[PDB]
Ligand binder design. Structure first.
Ligand SMILES: Cc1cn([C@H]2C[C@H](OP(=O)(O)O)[C@@H](COP(=O)(O)O)O2)c(=O)[nH]c1=O
Ligand SMILES: [Ca+2]
Length: 129
């Protein structure tokens, strides 16, 4: 997999963000995770976590996996990095997302994220509290 440039246009919620990629505005949905909806418990905290991580970064990058790059809603499907740190992983490690939506051939970082989830769960963080 390869990291490619993007810039933040606007935060949305815990697992989606509006980024400019190859010069075009796109909504990106984070691979292999699920955050609670803003309306749900830990939803606000996940949104805030993502927003801060992406807004504070000097460098945003997107990394597509091996399979489909857009979902049925036209959202980009990627791993998103903020100054080299993977947002997807960070949400899972903080107990602010569950590993989810693991479809074959877009699952390169599955084991990495399941390891973070196990740690979050052992620590009883947030969703696991
Ligand atoms: C994360 C992800 C979601 N999706 C689709 C599945 C779900 O369809 P449904 O809308 O039919 O439930 C929806 C979940 O996204 P949200 O969690 O953003 O709602 O997005 C993909 O198709 N591929 C993916 O990799
Ligand atoms: Ca969600």
């Amino acid at each position: 997999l390869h990291k490619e440039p993007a810039t933040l246009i606007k935060a949305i919620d815990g697992d989606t963000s509006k980024l400019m990629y190859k010069g075009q505005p796109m909504t990106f949905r984070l691979l292999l995770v699920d955050t609670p909806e803003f309306n749900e418990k830990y939803g606000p905290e996940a949104s805030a976590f993502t927003k801060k991580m992406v807004e504070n970064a000097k460098k945003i990058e997107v990394e597509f996996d091996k399979g489909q790059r857009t979902d049925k809603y036209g959202r980009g499907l990627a791993y998103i990095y903020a100054d080299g740190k993977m947002v997807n992983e960070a949400l899972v490690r903080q107990g602010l997302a569950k590993v989810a939506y693991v479809y074959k051939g877009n699952n390169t970082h599955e084991q990495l994220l399941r390891k973070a989830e196990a740690q979050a769960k052992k620590e009883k963080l947030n969703i696991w509290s």
